[PDB]
Amino acid sequence: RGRKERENSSQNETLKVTCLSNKEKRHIMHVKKMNQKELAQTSIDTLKLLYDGSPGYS
Amino acid sequence: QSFDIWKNLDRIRSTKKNAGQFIKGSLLILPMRTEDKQQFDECMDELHKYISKDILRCYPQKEQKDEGMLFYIVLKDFNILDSCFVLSVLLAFQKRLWMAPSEKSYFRVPKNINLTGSFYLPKNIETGSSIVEVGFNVVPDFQQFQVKACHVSKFMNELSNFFSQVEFGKCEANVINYFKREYNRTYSQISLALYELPLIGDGLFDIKSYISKTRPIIETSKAQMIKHISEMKAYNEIS
Amino acid sequence: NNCSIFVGDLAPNVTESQLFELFINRYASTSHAKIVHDQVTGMSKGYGFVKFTNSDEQQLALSEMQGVFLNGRAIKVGPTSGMSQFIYPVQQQPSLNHFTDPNNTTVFIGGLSSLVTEDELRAYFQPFGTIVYVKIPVGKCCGFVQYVDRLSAEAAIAGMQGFPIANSRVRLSWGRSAKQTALLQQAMLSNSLQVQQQQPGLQQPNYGYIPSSTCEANVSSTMLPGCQILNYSNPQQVIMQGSEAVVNSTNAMLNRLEQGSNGFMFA
Amino acid sequence: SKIQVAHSSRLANLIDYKLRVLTQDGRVYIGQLMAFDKHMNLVLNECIEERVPKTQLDKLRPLNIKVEKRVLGLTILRGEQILSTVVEDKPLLSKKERLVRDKKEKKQAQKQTKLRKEKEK
RNA sequence: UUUAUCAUUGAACUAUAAUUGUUCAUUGAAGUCAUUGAUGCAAACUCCUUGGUCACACACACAUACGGCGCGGAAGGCGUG
Numbered sequence: 001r002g003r004k005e006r007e008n009s010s011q012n013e014t015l016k017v018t019c020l021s022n023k024e025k026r027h028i029m030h031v032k033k034m035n036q037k038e039l040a041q042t043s044i045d046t047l048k049l050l051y052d053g054s055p056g057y058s
Numbered sequence: 059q060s061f062d063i064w065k066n067l068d069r070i071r072s073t074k075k076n077a078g079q080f081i082k083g084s085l086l087i088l089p090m091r092t093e094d095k096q097q098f099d100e101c102m103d104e105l106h107k108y109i110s111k112d113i114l115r116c117y118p119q120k121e122q123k124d125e126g127m128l129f130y131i132v133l134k135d136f137n138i139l140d141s142c143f144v145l146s147v148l149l150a151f152q153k154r155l156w157m158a159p160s161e162k163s164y165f166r167v168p169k170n171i172n173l174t175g176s177f178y179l180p181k182n183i184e185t186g187s188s189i190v191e192v193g194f195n196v197v198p199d200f201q202q203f204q205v206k207a208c209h210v211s212k213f214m215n216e217l218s219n220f221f222s223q224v225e226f227g228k229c230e231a232n233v234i235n236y237f238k239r240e241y242n243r244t245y246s247q248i249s250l251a252l253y254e255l256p257l258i259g260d261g262l263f264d265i266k267s268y269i270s271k272t273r274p275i276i277e278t279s280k281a282q283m284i285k286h287i288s289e290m291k292a293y294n295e296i297s
Numbered sequence: 298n299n300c301s302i303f304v305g306d307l308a309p310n311v312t313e314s315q316l317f318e319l320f321i322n323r324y325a326s327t328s329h330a331k332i333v334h335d336q337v338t339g340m341s342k343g344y345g346f347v348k349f350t351n352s353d354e355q356q357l358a359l360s361e362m363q364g365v366f367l368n369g370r371a372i373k374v375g376p377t378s379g380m381s382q383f384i385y386p387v388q389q390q391p392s393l394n395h396f397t398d399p400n401n402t403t404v405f406i407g408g409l410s411s412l413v414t415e416d417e418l419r420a421y422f423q424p425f426g427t428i429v430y431v432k433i434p435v436g437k438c439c440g441f442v443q444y445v446d447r448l449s450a451e452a453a454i455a456g457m458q459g460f461p462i463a464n465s466r467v468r469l470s471w472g473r474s475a476k477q478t479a480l481l482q483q484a485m486l487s488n489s490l491q492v493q494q495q496q497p498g499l500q501q502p503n504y505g506y507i508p509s510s511t512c513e514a515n516v517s518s519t520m521l522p523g524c525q526i527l528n529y530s531n532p533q534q535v536i537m538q539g540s541e542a543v544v545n546s547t548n549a550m551l552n553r554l555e556q557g558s559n560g561f562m563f564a
Numbered sequence: 565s566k567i568q569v570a571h572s573s574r575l576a577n578l579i580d581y582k583l584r585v586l587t588q589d590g591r592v593y594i595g596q597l598m599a600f601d602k603h604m605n606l607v608l609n610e611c612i613e614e615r616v617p618k619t620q621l622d623k624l625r626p627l628n629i630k631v632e633k634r635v636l637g638l639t640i641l642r643g644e645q646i647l648s649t650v651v652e653d654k655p656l657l658s659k660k661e662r663l664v665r666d667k668k669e670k671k672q673a674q675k676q677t678k679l680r681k682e683k684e685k
Numbered sequence: 686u687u688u689a690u691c692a693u694u695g696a697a698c699u700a701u702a703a704u705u706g707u708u709c710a711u712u713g714a715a716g717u718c719a720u721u722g723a724u725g726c727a728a729a730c731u732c733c734u735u736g737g738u739c740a741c742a743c744a745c746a747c748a749u750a751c752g753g754c755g756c757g758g759a760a761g762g763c764g765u766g
Binding site: 258265268272276279285293295296297 | 429443474475479499503520521523526527529533534535
Binding site: 566567568569570571617618619620623630654656658659660 | 724725734735758759760761762
């Protein structure tokens with residue numbers, strides 16, 4: 001990398017890294033996987049139950 | 059400025075910055091109605107002596123009502139000046155029959171009259187005030203445009219400012235007959251709806267089954283209303 | 298709380314009375330019990346719901362009935378209700394004042410000059426909807442306008458706000474009735490509870506009535522939906538809406554103009 | 565296109581190459597082959613079919629040519645209405661990486677046969 | 686720049702056609718959507734996948750035209766066991 005980029009980037013600030021333990025990241029990724037699969041399987045079904053008494057429902 | 063059409067035509071020819079070029083693929087349809095035909099014919103003959111046959115065309119009705127005629131005025135491939143001239147003449151003439159029956163001049167507009175009208179344009183427009191658009195138009199294909207309560211010079215300036223911003227293009231060939239059939243279909247539907255107005259009671263609603271279908275229901279609703287009045291009287295009572 | 302328990306795999310000779318006897322009156326109090334039968338055959342499918350008021354008694358009943366002899370088989374009385382992102386929204390209540398009641402249709406009017414009458418104040422609020430009483434307190438420069446509809450109260454507040462009656466600007470808000478105001482004054486003099494009561498409903502659905510509709514006046518009614526069927530009378534009873542209503546209203550307003558041009562009424 | 569296609573390779577060696585196969589019409593299909601047969605029926609992954617219009621053909625007759633490209637994805641093309649096939653673009657992973665991948669597939673297949681022999685006992 | 690259905694008849698009609706052409710309509714069979722459509726032309730902006738984003742130095746070489754005399758990787762040719 002360039003010199004002036006190094007004098008600009010190493011003087012602005014130093015950010016904080018967050019990190020979690022093994023069981024915490026395992027439980028969070030398992031909840032995210034079940035949320036992704038329940039969003040991939042779901043669909044909006046409001047028009048079927050909202051026009052239920054319509055004369056052309058059958 | 060003045061109350062003359064030709065002076066405002068000279069003014070709108072002067073300071074509209076080379077407005078002699080017409081619009082490629084341009085179309086306008088003005089459906090109007092007259093009580094009588096003989097007074098309309100002299101003004102239309104003067105208009106055809108002033109405006110050419112290729113630019114403006116006229117379409118009569120089929121004489122179904124026999125009292126109120128319906129005439130289409132189709133301006134095709136028109137310039138911005140001839141449009142203002144034709145709309146000024148027609149908007150003066152279709153209101154002079156009610157306001158000034160004794161003035162007797164088909165090209166001199168008085169001061170007591172305000173120009174207020176409605177004209178159709180095709181859907182393919184691009185605008186990128188007195189003339190406004192409409193919401194909930196009745197025609198499937200065309201857009202209705204409204205002008206209201208203007209003098210002659212304001213009408214000229216507003217029509218020129220409207221046609222200087224809008225961009226037409228690529229109109230369908232026999233769209234005039236399509237608009238004729240759709241207009242006749244829509245107003246025949248509302249004429250049939252007015253024909254359905256005496257046929258409400260006992261005519262075509264199957265009243266013999268509709269009484270028996272709602273005979274216990276209105277009675278139970280009336281009992282609920284009586285219970286509501288009694289419960290309201292018990293609620294407002296101090297005792 | 299209304300805790301629900303789902304009994305399953307029941308026998309065929311077990312009606313709702315036997316399930317209610319086995320659920321209620323055994324160290325608990327079951328509020329409701331219903332066995333889900335067939336839609337057209339009438340026979341029970343072997344499942345039933347039991348909803349109790351307390352959750353602890355329902356939990357004790359589910360713990361005691363887990364494996365009990367129910368008509369020759371097991372009871373299976375485990376609970377039905379009680380990590381997804383989608384949950385139904387839950388809310389608290391505004392403790393039922395006279396502002397947050399959707400059935401509250403009476404408008405408190407104030408800022409009067411102690412000069413308007415009751416018939417004139419009826420004439421201010423007459424075309425907004427049907428009305429029941431226009432009585433006002435004396436010496437308090439205020440009043441009460443109770444309608445039947447809530448949309449009529451919305452139209453009355455949206456129109457009549459900022460309208461000066463007798464060179465005096467009006468103040469429109471909500472309020473209770475006279476008996477509820479007397480109860481609030483009796484409970485506020487000792488300051489024990491000061492609790493209010495909700496205004497009763499209309500026992501909906503109501504097909505015949507059309508809201509924001511007034512009628513002052515044999516009847517052969519076709520009961521068609523485009524017209525009006527029933528209406529509340531103007532004091533009060535329930536009237537069938539006839540066809541000669543706009544004619545009677547026109548005769549009434551012409552009589553009102555004739556009697557108001559002379560001074561027989563001020564309203 | 566400086567690809568330097570192999571000088572002594574055949575269809576068993578040209579597998580997983582981004583082919584540019586020509587047909588009798590000239591409807592050129594671009595995509596990776598993954599299988600063939602005796603009749604040269606070619607499956608094509610991420611395939612695109614490109615043509616030239618009739619108006620562009622006058623400009624093509626003796627510059628820029630606007631070809632019409634449609635996207636077919638994974639298709640399976642027959643060997644009757646095709647004319648010639650060439651190699652247009654090299655694949656992503658190299659020959660040594662495909663060799664290591666094939667050794668891993670052979671070891672996984674031998675492990676699967678040992679698992680079938682263990683489940684059979 | 687270019688197209689957006691034919692036929693019988695009625696009131697006139699150019700007319701070798703299954704009245705083709707002009708204005709209006711009744712009727713008859715299918716009746717791509719698309720006209721902000723289709724073709725050609727041309728510029729600018731933005732975003733995606735790929736790499737050795739490598740080791741030394743910011744340097745005066747060449748008519749036999751260029752010291753291909755670094756560690757590798759990708760594709761290929763030729764030769765040997």
